[PDB]
Amino acid sequence: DHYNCVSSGGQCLYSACPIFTKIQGTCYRGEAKCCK
């Protein structure tokens, strides 16, 4: 979720994770990705 994304060093994005980064979870009720 958003708070886990913040605290883990990821970024919540509606757009795709940048190429070298990976999905770690989601944010905002499953609608966005947590990328790191």
PDB file of C-alpha atoms in Angstrom:
ATOM      1  CA  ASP A   1       0.000   0.000   0.000  1.00  0.00           C
ATOM      2  CA  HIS A   2       1.058   3.654   0.027  1.00  0.00           C
ATOM      3  CA  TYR A   3       2.544   3.667   3.535  1.00  0.00           C
ATOM      4  CA  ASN A   4       4.545   0.481   2.938  1.00  0.00           C
ATOM      5  CA  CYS A   5       5.773   1.926  -0.385  1.00  0.00           C
ATOM      6  CA  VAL A   6       6.960   5.153   1.323  1.00  0.00           C
ATOM      7  CA  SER A   7       8.735   3.367   4.154  1.00  0.00           C
ATOM      8  CA  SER A   8      10.382   0.731   1.910  1.00  0.00           C
ATOM      9  CA  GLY A   9      11.926   3.237  -0.533  1.00  0.00           C
ATOM     10  CA  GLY A  10       9.571   2.659  -3.438  1.00  0.00           C
ATOM     11  CA  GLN A  11       7.579   5.086  -5.548  1.00  0.00           C
ATOM     12  CA  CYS A  12       3.825   4.800  -6.158  1.00  0.00           C
ATOM     13  CA  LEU A  13       3.170   5.137  -9.912  1.00  0.00           C
ATOM     14  CA  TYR A  14       0.033   4.828 -12.035  1.00  0.00           C
ATOM     15  CA  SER A  15       2.437   4.626 -14.973  1.00  0.00           C
ATOM     16  CA  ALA A  16       4.746   1.700 -15.425  1.00  0.00           C
ATOM     17  CA  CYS A  17       7.739   0.938 -13.300  1.00  0.00           C
ATOM     18  CA  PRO A  18      10.858   2.323 -15.050  1.00  0.00           C
ATOM     19  CA  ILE A  19      12.780  -0.457 -16.823  1.00  0.00           C
ATOM     20  CA  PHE A  20      15.479  -1.314 -14.323  1.00  0.00           C
ATOM     21  CA  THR A  21      12.975  -1.213 -11.396  1.00  0.00           C
ATOM     22  CA  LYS A  22      10.558  -3.858 -10.170  1.00  0.00           C
ATOM     23  CA  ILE A  23       7.088  -4.073  -8.636  1.00  0.00           C
ATOM     24  CA  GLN A  24       7.250  -4.357  -4.826  1.00  0.00           C
ATOM     25  CA  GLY A  25       3.509  -4.057  -4.147  1.00  0.00           C
ATOM     26  CA  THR A  26       0.740  -1.653  -5.055  1.00  0.00           C
ATOM     27  CA  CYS A  27      -0.627   1.666  -3.840  1.00  0.00           C
ATOM     28  CA  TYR A  28      -3.985   3.415  -3.645  1.00  0.00           C
ATOM     29  CA  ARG A  29      -6.369   0.427  -3.414  1.00  0.00           C
ATOM     30  CA  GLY A  30      -4.487  -1.690  -5.946  1.00  0.00           C
ATOM     31  CA  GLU A  31      -4.632   0.866  -8.771  1.00  0.00           C
ATOM     32  CA  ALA A  32      -1.005   2.018  -8.832  1.00  0.00           C
ATOM     33  CA  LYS A  33       2.296   0.095  -8.572  1.00  0.00           C
ATOM     34  CA  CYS A  34       4.956   0.462  -5.870  1.00  0.00           C
ATOM     35  CA  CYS A  35       8.188   0.471  -7.930  1.00  0.00           C
ATOM     36  CA  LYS A  36      11.796   0.204  -6.714  1.00  0.00           C
TER      37      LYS A  36
END
